[PDB]
Write a protein that binds this ligand. Structure first.
Ligand SMILES: CC(C)CN(C[C@@H](O)[C@H](Cc1ccccc1)NC(=O)O[C@H]1C[C@H]2CO[C@H]3O[C@@H]1C[C@@H]23)S(=O)(=O)c1ccc2nc(NC(C)C)oc2c1
Ligand SMILES: [Cl-]
Ligand SMILES: [Cl-]
Ligand code: NA
Lengths: 99, 99
């Protein structure tokens, strides 16, 4: 699709069999989702956003569907205010910015 | 242009007579620029992201040139770690997300 930006670019994602809403975010290097259970091991990561830095749990090689497109990659879990799909998975679904 | 997302989508902007680098950010509702002077009236505002909130000055009806395209809108000025062009100005240059 072609998504205009008059409203937030929210899409449905599916992770762990669950549907969630997430924001397609070209200003995010990585994908960050609200607290949930994911399989496997995690590693620590610090991420800096507008209000300072927070600690998240990094899970690698996680299967996630984004707007009907399949991706398999890194998901960070932590106290983000909204689920964000960042460039690491936007690239997997072929997304570009155009003007 | 078509901007891929393998790296941060940074562009040059002109604002307040100054050239700056800024992130084209579909996850940002508003445009937020690092501390600088702008003319006219302003009012305080709080905006929240990962890490929490920062206080900014809200200036309305500010012209910005973004990658060569002029636009007008509200610009928030405050201690953001990066200059962000948010949806309120991305729409005016006709930016879309495509995949
Ligand atoms: C988290 C998003 C929902 C919103 N942000 C935009 C993001 O694209 C930021 C932009 C931004 C800010 C500060 C530093 C870098 C980028 N990304 C981000 O935090 O990525 C960071 C967090 C994580 C995400 O993936 C990696 O990217 C960095 C570090 C890791 S925001 O910068 O907090 C932001 C911007 C304008 C806004 N306008 C508003 N208005 C409200 C009142 C409706 O809120 C705003 C919040
Ligand atoms: Cl505006
Ligand atoms: Cl349009
Ligand atoms: Na003004």
């Amino acid at each position: 699709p072609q998504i205009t930006l008059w409203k937030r670019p929210l899409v449905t994602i599916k992770i762990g069999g669950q549907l969630k809403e997430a924001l397609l975010d070209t200003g995010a290097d990585d994908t960050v989702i609200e607290e949930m259970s994911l399989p496997g091991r995690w590693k620590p990561k610090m991420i800096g956003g507008i209000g300072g830095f927070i600690k998240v749990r990094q899970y690698d090689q996680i299967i996630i569907e984004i707007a009907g497109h399949k991706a398999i990659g890194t998901v960070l879990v932590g106290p983000t205010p909204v689920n964000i799909i960042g460039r690491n998975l936007l690239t997997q679904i072929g997304a570009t910015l155009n003007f």
